[model samples]
Target: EYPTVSEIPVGEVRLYQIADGVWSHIATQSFDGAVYPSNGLIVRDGDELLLIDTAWGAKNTAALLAEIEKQIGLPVTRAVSTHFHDDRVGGVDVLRAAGVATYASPSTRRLAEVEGNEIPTHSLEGLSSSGDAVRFGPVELFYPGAAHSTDNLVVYVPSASVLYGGCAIYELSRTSAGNVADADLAEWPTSIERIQQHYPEAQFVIPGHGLPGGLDLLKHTTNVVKAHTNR
Candidate 1:
């Protein structure tokens, strides 16, 4: 699917192909005239399907999950929240109800606990920080450092050379870096720099909310962070 919006009962979910093997899922929630679209990923790892982040909320997440299984015929087995934000973990309840083994960084788990947001089922082995990596079957999850959120983690798919940066990476279509409420301002630019150095092979770089781009997304994100910090 180049770009197809599935007609689901819960919501209008958009799906896009990220290469040969990866899929991009977009779930939307509107407030008055304001529209917010959250992007997540669906990657098949042999027998298991991986959900990176989730839809905007439970209903939309459920809609997208069902739509994915309908199109791909494989249930999502694993899910990882890039951070504790609603856009990232809003579907934790839905995933939990579906019996999916959801994961979050230790910090993400703890932060969610403190904030009383719905938490993930499992925590990764180590702390959530720069250079920390864990393999979820075929995909690699890495914490580049604090950026959009202090617990932000990124997922890279070697099979398709696509990187899902959650809210940590900014889309070029956006003029400003988004939602810095949970961000580490001093480290934001440096974190994107680390991602740029680490994932040179990632041909398709996806942001948390908008269109996916190439390496330029990383650079643009850093610049966007710098501008906000300067402003």
Candidate 2:
């Protein structure tokens, strides 16, 4: 059976129920005379929520968190920024202020600091640095090597059968490789393949931008990466 979705639109940000206590958020920022939405996840364990990634910047992230407390009646107690990009960790200031247990990869933290992006309070380096899947309550963070960004990671909820591809996986709406200034072309396709094998039971796949997709997104991402690798 398909899981029912209950969408709550808070300002320009949108949150969707993916499966059971698992939810997804879409935050926007203006670009090219249009708005671009980046996807993230919120996984609930009892009364506390684990936020995966964040909105565009500080203001939007604050607004989204405020709305989450009001609408869902749950406080976000933990967080993970899948990469070092602005859309992924731009709200680190807000999160750090609230005393949430925030996490990022070692490289993510280093890159964030170098790029002047607000880095997370903690590093998941020790837990998942060996490229193993490490669980933080409901969601698990896995580093399969470099793809979209040098430190990009995939978030997965084993209980919910949902996999968050973040910016590492290509959205169905995209035809290009997106931002690759820090991408590793040689390892990207294999990285995607690793994801495909790692989460074969993932029923719902959430990408960084655009709409949520199915397992096809993984294959499509590999194809898209290969198409550009010129190998």
Best by TM-score: 1
* Model 2 score (lDDT): 0.81
User: What ranges in model 2 sit over 4 Å off?
Assistant: 1-11, 31-34, 127-130
Q: Over the stretch 1-231, how does candidate 1's per-residue lDDT look in tens digits?
A: 233223322366767877766888887766446567778888987887888888878888888878887888887888888888777788799999998999888899999888888899888876455787888877898888888878888889988889898888878878776557778989888888788788888888998877788989888888888888678
Error of 1 at 65 (Å): 1.6
RMSD of 1: 2.4
Candidate 2 residue pairs that clash: none
Error of 2 at 163 (Å): 0.3
Tens-digit lDDT string for candidate 2 (1-231): 221112323235667888898888876775456566778899897789899998878888888787688778788888998899888988889887877888888889999999988988787755344357887777778888888887889988999889999988777768788557889988888888788888989999988877778899988888888888674
- Inter-residue clash pairs, candidate 1: none
